[PDB]
Amino acid sequence: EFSRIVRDVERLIAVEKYSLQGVVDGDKLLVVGFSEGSVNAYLYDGGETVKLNREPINSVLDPHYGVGRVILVRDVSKGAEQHALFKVNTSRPGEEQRLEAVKPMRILSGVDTGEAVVFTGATEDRVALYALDGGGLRELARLPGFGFVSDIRGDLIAGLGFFGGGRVSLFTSNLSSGGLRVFDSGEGSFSSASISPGMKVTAGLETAREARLVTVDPRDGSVEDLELPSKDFSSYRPTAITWLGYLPDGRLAVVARREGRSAVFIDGERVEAPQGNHGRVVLWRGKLVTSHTSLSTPPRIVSLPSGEPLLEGGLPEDLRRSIAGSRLVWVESFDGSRVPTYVLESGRAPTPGPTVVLVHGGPFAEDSDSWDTFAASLAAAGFHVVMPNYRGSTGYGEEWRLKIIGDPCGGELEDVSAAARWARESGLASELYIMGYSYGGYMTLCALTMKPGLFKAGVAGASVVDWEEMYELSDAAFRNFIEQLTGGSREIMRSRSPINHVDRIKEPLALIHPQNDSRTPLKPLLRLMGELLARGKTFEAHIIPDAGHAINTMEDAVKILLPAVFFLATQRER
Amino acid sequence: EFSRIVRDVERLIAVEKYSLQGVVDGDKLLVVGFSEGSVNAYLYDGGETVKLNREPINSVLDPHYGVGRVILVRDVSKGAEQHALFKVNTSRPGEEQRLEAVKPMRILSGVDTGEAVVFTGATEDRVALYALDGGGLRELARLPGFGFVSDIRGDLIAGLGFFGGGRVSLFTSNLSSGGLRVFDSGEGSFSSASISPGMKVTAGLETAREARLVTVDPRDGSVEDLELPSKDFSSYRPTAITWLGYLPDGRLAVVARREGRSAVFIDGERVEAPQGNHGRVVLWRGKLVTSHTSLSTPPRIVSLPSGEPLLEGGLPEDLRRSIAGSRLVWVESFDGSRVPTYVLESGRAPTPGPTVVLVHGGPFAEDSDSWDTFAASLAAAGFHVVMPNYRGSTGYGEEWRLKIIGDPCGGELEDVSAAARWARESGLASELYIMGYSYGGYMTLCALTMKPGLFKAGVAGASVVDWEEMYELSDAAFRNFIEQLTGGSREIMRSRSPINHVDRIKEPLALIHPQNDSRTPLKPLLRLMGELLARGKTFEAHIIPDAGHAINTMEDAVKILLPAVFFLATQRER
Ligand SMILES: [Cl-]
């Protein structure tokens, strides 16, 4: 029945998905949309979307309210994520002017004030904060690691820095003269940031098991808790902060979350919103607008508190019926920790039935009540889906997130393995598979090498294979992240690399990998194939042309997803 | 959509295909069939088939008329073609007894007398003629290269030997006492052989541009032309001899061919047969039976002279209509030689239209008026198909066949390239692709490296990549074949290896390869991928698990064929 599968996977990939970016030109929404087979940028106003870009893009920079242009970010390296920036004047959609003062680099983030384009980027030798204005390009600061611009008000630039130990610092700079100041909390990590009318930095602070709001004065580094007019926020007791931002009327919008579902607050007061997860919030036409998604709702743009959709891709009825349910469960792991695990029940599988432990990437990411095309495709193909938030995940507090540091292929793998055991013991699973992309594919390899026999077969997509060789091929941002994750230990880099444990593998493995991935490079995957072959192991492989880690077309998504589904479907017929 | 493609490809692979092997037990036909998703062995006696084997096989040994058992040949190495032999008593189908005296080896051929099993096999160090009887296993003779047992009558064993220069010798042995006698012709190559009631060896002799029948007296090596009672055979002036064999009533059956179509003769008299190609001929309940195939007929078993089908997988009408036409054309090549080229016009493509030069394997093989699943799948996918009998091909005389010796990636490539020129100049092709498996995949790599720009893109399946490295990884039979092809020259082995010319590649390439292929091993392909990556070339790859050069399940066929069709369909949308 592999042709009905191809049709489903294609349709699931093809459904339109929207992301809210801001408000530009004359009170028009700026949205990034996956539509017509690729990622594009649109203006929305009444009913007509207007396409701003020509060729597919990856993202746009964050515009200040009402600015008359959009800065596209586009990979100009066939997936290697050397990106260039292209200005589109909102009054002349489809006319792109490349910003040639900026040589290609990995663009990490940025904001457009209308007078300066401020962005962070990584090259081979550094990560930096840059400003481009009418006078040309300037390097404001070199950063100690991944950094992201959060907000600019006047000359004050605020951002978030991964500058050591897995922890997130706040940073500020000056638009006119550059420099850098770093603010490190001893309680936890800063999570989102926005500059108040008073020129203090409002930030989410994620502590051991909770999250709150703080005010940082960039002049003296003083921090204090921020109390809001309404106490709905406090009383919600979020674990994590998704996003926050000052609206143009001075009110503070915050999206915060717990147990994989978020809520929206304006000056601390709850605003009704559809169940699942939300993104940015903007004031448009004097009304509140956000993005929304859930496990059964592809990302869409909705009005609050109505919940009425402004932009939404429809899911076909027959596909909707493929997802028979979802649940959040707490799996007990090796040390007694409770692993929050999202479960998707297939309507096309019995119970007990074939079940895939689909391991998330990052590692600093989470499985949540948010749309997941891979999880949906598995349900449509007749597999239940188990999605464990292993230690290292976001969404459950700083202490759980930091447990991974210095211990890749250790406790987090136990968490994945405990989720696998739960799926069988709880009676959901008749047979067990493992699948993941990126850090998830790492986990597949680690499970098959370190836990032979636990799974029937594994799918490893865009995998980490060898920390040591990857390190040598990585840009400045990735080198630093590798050092942080591995705790700067060569012994960890080696012992936790599954290329060094190939002899232990006993289960069928499918490798899937984009040839131009600059994060998880193909080179070590070739050596892994060589090891599998020399040792007589069973394996299959699919390498995808002219694509990298970030997939921005339906054609590339099909090529990275379909083989995995075919492979698992074929395994299930054994 | 790709899902309608998956469906047609699957259906084209799934249609049942039959090969006639002999007559066993109580006048029952023995057939090998691709059916129920794999290659199996069957008895047929007027009604439903009876399955002899359990797990899929590769082939059966050639039984003497009426023997009460069948010897299955099965790969027990997950595609690496280390096979074992399994006896099935024809009265107890489905019960297999492994012949343990015979360790796994590449079984090349063999005959079962009912009292002795005589076969040729290759190990790392030898190719040998073996006999297994009540007394155990005995090595009758070591052979100078690939050899195939053709017939046994009494104590006399006759076979065909590739014992130098691409030329085929006859050999004989004695079942009781072993040994080896080799008979060479200065005029050409022996093609098929059967022992007359007079204990002479009747053989087809293929000469420079023609074929005939000869009588070899194994006692003195004397040769003379064989005159048959009816002159239809000699007046047909075949170019090649497909098969010959004495029927149990003493009559000589011959199948011979010219221009990619065969004819069947019985004591020299033509018997009417369906247009296309025929396999072995047997007498069954006193009536003649053979296999038949054509470009629009999957291999089936028919009665002669009527042509009524005994066993036939019916080609669905809608798939039949996907081939709008076929032609045999004579492409003019670089040196004036005329390359007989078979052409399928797709009913789902305009003219001019996307066209694939689909290069056959071997190299000692031909494109003929014979079913080809790959070619049918390309027509169904909306490509015209061009299949050139490049120099080295069978069917057109000894001289054309031996031109390739000492010159791989030379003249034959010119023939393939002339075919591509013809497709464009004749007005068939709007755009050109190259696709092939095995020696065909070699040709793809050779075209992309030596003729950059001629093709839009290529599919290389189970390719020859590096003659030097493959030589070092080959068994005794393959090493010898490699020396024969390359003319024993280390310079040819290197300069005609496309891994040495990777920098020249400019077109998109899709590699497809079974992991356990022992003929065209995966190992050099991994190095090729390393080279393509290091040099920044666009490529995709699909490596198939637990399979080798000889595909014997529908699931493995889908895995080797579908990626090629997807890739070309995608290329066509550029
Ligand atoms: Cl067959």
What are A's interface residues with B at a Cβ cutoff of 8 A? 2-4, 6-7, 10, 78, 508, 510, 515, 522-523, 526, 529-530, 533, 538-546, 555, 558-559, 563, 570
Angle between helices B554-573 and B373-380 (to 10 degrees): 40
Residue type, B337: S
Rounded CA-CA distance A222/A215 in Å is 8
Distance B300 CA to ligand 1 centre (A): 10
Residue showing tokens 């009418």: A134
Strand partners, A256: A241, A263
Kindly report the backbone phi and psi dihedral angles of residue B225, in degrees, each rounded to the nearest multiple of 5, phi listed first.
Answer: -70, 145
The resolution, in Å, is 1.9
Q: What is the DSSP letter of A538?
A: -
A490: its two tokens? 């060569």
Å from A525 to nearest chain B CA? 10
Angle between helices A2-14 and B2-14 (to 10 degrees): 170
Say if CB B38 and CB B31 are below 8 A apart.
Answer: no
Measured CA distances, B225 to A208, B201, B216, B236 (Å): 96, 12, 9, 16
Chain A residues in contact with B513 by the CB 8 A cut-off are none
Rounded CA-CA distance A328/A320 in Å is 20
Chain A residue with minimum CA distance to B9: A3
Q: Which of A401, A378, A393 is nearest to A326 (CA)?
A: A378
Sheet of A17-24: strand order equals: A17-24, A28-35, A38-44, A49-51
Q: Is A430 exposed, middle or buried (0-12, 13-18, 19+ CB in 10 A)?
A: middle
Rounded CA-CA distance B418/B449 in Å is 16
Say if CB A72 and CB A62 are below 8 A apart.
Answer: no
Rounded CA-CA distance B23/A503 in Å is 48
How many Cβ atoms are within 10 Å of A97's Cβ, its own excluded? 12
In A286-431, where does DSSP find H-type helix? 317-320, 373-380, 398-402, 411-425
Calculated CA dihedral for residues A400, A404, A409, A412, nearest 10 degrees:
10
Catalytic residue list contains B438: yes
Rounded CA-CA distance B52/B536 in Å is 52
Calculated CA dihedral for residues B117, B121, B124, B126, nearest 10 degrees:
90
3-state secondary structure at position B464: coil
Distance B249 CA to ligand 1 centre (A): 28
Catalytic residue among B151, B372, B466, B517: B517
Catalytic residue among B438, B463, B474, B518: B438
Rounded CA-CA distance A185/B460 in Å is 57
Say if CB A275 and CB A290 are below 8 A apart.
Answer: no
Å from A544 to nearest chain B CA? 5
Q: What is the DSSP letter of A412?
A: H
What experiment produced this structure?
X-ray
3-state secondary structure at position A33: strand
Q: Closest partner residue to B541 among A6, A7, A543, by Cβ? A: A543
Rounded CA-CA distance B517/B526 in Å is 13
Can you identify the CATH homologous superfamily of domain A315-574? Alpha/Beta hydrolase fold, catalytic domain (3.40.50.1820)
Measured CA distances, A489 to A341, A350, A464, A475, B408 (Å): 30, 46, 17, 19, 52
CB–CB contact A515 B533 (8 Å): yes
Cβ contacts of B331 within 8 Å, gap of 6 or more: B338, B339, B341, B388, B415, B418, B419, B421, B422
What are B's interface residues with A at a Cβ cutoff of 8 A? 1-4, 6-7, 10, 78, 508, 510, 515, 522-523, 526, 529-530, 533, 538-546, 555, 558-559, 563, 570
CB–CB contact A515 B540 (8 Å): yes
Distance A364 CA to ligand 1 centre (A): 52
Chain A residues in contact with B6 by the CB 8 A cut-off are 2-3, 6
Query: Dmax of chain A from CA atoms?
Result: 67
Q: What is the DSSP letter of B553?
A: B
Q: Closest partner residue to A2 among B6, B526, B539, by Cβ? A: B6
Sheet of B156-164: strand order equals: B147-153, B156-164, B167-174, B178-183
Chain A residues in contact with B563 by the CB 8 A cut-off are 542
Residue showing tokens 């900026």: A102
Q: Which of A374, A384, A389, A376 is nearest to A328 (CA)?
A: A389
Residue showing tokens 């002349």: A92
Rounded CA-CA distance B428/B433 in Å is 13
Q: Is the peptide bond before B452 cis (omega within 30 degrees of 0)?
A: no
Å from B490 to nearest chain A CA? 26
Å from B55 to nearest chain A CA? 13
Say if CB A420 and CB A435 are below 8 A apart.
Answer: no
CB–CB contact A545 B523 (8 Å): no
A20: its two tokens? 């809210």
3-state secondary structure at position A52: coil
Rounded CA-CA distance B389/B369 in Å is 12
CB–CB contacts below 8 A, A to B: 78
Residue showing tokens 């996918």: B381
Q: What is the DSSP letter of B550?
A: S
Instruction: Give me the DSSP letters along A480-498.
Output: HHHHHHHTT-HHHHHHT-G
3-state secondary structure at position B486: helix
Q: Which of B267, B275, B262, B272 is nearest to B236 (CA)?
A: B262
Cβ contacts of A235 within 8 Å, gap of 6 or more: none
Residue type, A71: I
Say if CB A153 and CB A111 are below 8 A apart.
Answer: no
CB–CB contact B546 A555 (8 Å): no
Cβ contacts of A205 within 8 Å, gap of 6 or more: A185, A187, A188, A189, A190, A191, A211, A212, A213, A214, A241
Chain B residue with minimum CA distance to A539: B545
Cβ density class B415-428: b for 16+ within 10 Å, e for less: bbbbbbbbbeeeeb
Q: Closest partner residue to B2 among A6, A515, A570, by Cβ? A: A6
Rounded CA-CA distance A314/A310 in Å is 12
Residues of A annotated as catalytic (active site), given as ranges:
438, 517, 549
* Dihedral sign for Cα atoms in the order A304, A306, A307, A310: negative
How many Cβ atoms are within 10 Å of B491's Cβ, its own excluded? 9
Rounded CA-CA distance B22/B62 in Å is 7
Rounded CA-CA distance A27/A94 in Å is 19
Rounded CA-CA distance B11/B2 in Å is 14
**Through-space distance between the first and last CA atoms of chain B, rounded to whole angstroms:** 15
Write out the CATH class of domain B15-314: mainly beta
Measured CA distances, A217 to A149, A178, A355, B93 (Å): 17, 18, 50, 87
Say if CB B300 and CB B292 are below 8 A apart.
Answer: yes
Chain B residue with minimum CA distance to A522: B533
Rounded CA-CA distance A566/B329 in Å is 40
Rounded CA-CA distance A382/A431 in Å is 12
CB–CB contact B526 A522 (8 Å): no
Nearest-5° angle of CA A552, CA A557, CA A561? 155
A525: its two tokens? 């995957």
Chain B residue with minimum CA distance to A78: B538
3-state secondary structure at position A499: helix
Q: Closest partner residue to B544 among A530, A533, A540, by Cβ? A: A540
3-state secondary structure at position A500: helix
Å from A323 to nearest chain B CA? 22
Say if CB B189 and CB B203 are below 8 A apart.
Answer: no
Å from A462 to nearest chain B CA? 14
HSE (side-chain half, CA atoms, 13 Å) at A561: 27
Query: Could you tell me where the beta strands, DSSP code E, fall in B92-155?
Result: 97-98, 106-112, 117-122, 127-133, 136-143, 147-153
Backbone torsion region of residue B508, taken as left when φ is above 0, otherwise alpha when ψ lies between -120 and 50, otherwise beta:
beta
Distance A51 CA to ligand 1 centre (A): 54
Chain B residues in contact with A564 by the CB 8 A cut-off are none
B211: its two tokens? 């074929």
Q: Which of A322, A320, A292 is nearest to A305 (CA)?
A: A292
Rounded CA-CA distance A174/A180 in Å is 8
Q: Closest partner residue to B526 among A7, A526, A570, by Cβ? A: A526
Rounded CA-CA distance A343/A353 in Å is 13
Distance B315 CA to ligand 1 centre (A): 16
Q: Closest partner residue to A538 among B10, B546, B559, by Cβ? A: B546
Say if CB A341 and CB A419 are below 8 A apart.
Answer: yes
Distance B263 CA to ligand 1 centre (A): 21
Which residue of B526, B555, B571 to mutate against A (max A Cβ within 10 Å)? Answer: B526
Instruction: Give me the DSSP letters along A378-406.
Output: HHHTT-EEEEE--TT-SSS-HHHHHTTTT
Rounded CA-CA distance B116/B85 in Å is 13
Say if CB A367 and CB A295 are below 8 A apart.
Answer: no
Q: Is A329 exposed, middle or buried (0-12, 13-18, 19+ CB in 10 A)?
A: middle
Distance B39 CA to ligand 1 centre (A): 6
Strand partners, B164: B167
Cβ density class A335-345: b for 16+ within 10 Å, e for less: eebebbbbbbb
Measured CA distances, A225 to A194, A214, A215, A216 (Å): 15, 4, 6, 9
CB–CB contact A533 B544 (8 Å): no
Rounded CA-CA distance A398/A366 in Å is 13
Rounded CA-CA distance A111/A158 in Å is 11
Cβ contacts of A169 within 8 Å, gap of 6 or more: A160, A161, A162, A163, A182, A183, A184, A185, A189, A190
Say if CB A61 and CB A102 are below 8 A apart.
Answer: no
Rounded CA-CA distance A69/A75 in Å is 20
Instruction: Give me the DSSP letters along A430-461.
Output: EEEEEEEETHHHHHHHHHHHHSTTT-SEEEEE
B353-359 and B429-437 strand pairing: parallel
Query: Could you tell me where the beta strands, DSSP code E, fall in B144-286?
Result: 147-153, 156-164, 167-174, 178-183, 189-195, 201-206, 211-216, 223-225, 240-246, 252-258, 261-266, 269-271, 277-284
Q: Is the peptide bond before B340 cis (omega within 30 degrees of 0)?
A: no
Say if CB A378 and CB A358 are below 8 A apart.
Answer: yes
3-state secondary structure at position A501: helix
Q: Closest partner residue to B3 among A3, A529, A555, by Cβ? A: A3
CB–CB contact B10 A4 (8 Å): no
Q: Is the peptide bond before B363 cis (omega within 30 degrees of 0)?
A: yes
Q: In residues, how long is chain A?
A: 574
Radius of gyration of chain A (CA): 23
Cβ density class A514-546: b for 16+ within 10 Å, e for less: bbbbbbbbbbbbbbbbbbbbeeebbbbbbbbbb
What residues sit around ligand 1, an ion, with C-beta below 5 angstroms?
Answer: B 19, 34
Rounded CA-CA distance B354/B350 in Å is 8
Residue showing tokens 């989410």: A204
Q: What is the DSSP letter of A313?
A: P
Distance A366 CA to ligand 1 centre (A): 50
Sheet of A83-89: strand order equals: A59-60, A69-75, A83-89, A96-98
If you count DSSP H runs as helices and E runs as strands, how many of each does chain B have, helices first? Answer: 12, 37
A549: its two tokens? 């880690």
Chain A residues in contact with B541 by the CB 8 A cut-off are 541-543
Distance B250 CA to ligand 1 centre (A): 29
Nearest-5° angle of CA A245, CA A248, CA A251? 60
Residue type, B177: S
Domain boundary assignment for chain A: 15-314, 315-574
Distance B379 CA to ligand 1 centre (A): 22
Strand partners, B193: B203
Say if CB A448 and CB A99 are below 8 A apart.
Answer: no
Cβ contacts of B361 within 8 Å, gap of 6 or more: B436, B437, B438, B439, B440
3-state secondary structure at position B405: coil
CB–CB contact A508 B545 (8 Å): yes
Chain B residues in contact with A10 by the CB 8 A cut-off are 1-3
The distance of Cα A444 from the centroid of its chain, to the nearest Å, equals 19
Which residue of B448, B533, B544 to mutate against A (max A Cβ within 10 Å)? Answer: B533
CB–CB contact A515 B539 (8 Å): yes
Q: Is the peptide bond before B352 cis (omega within 30 degrees of 0)?
A: yes
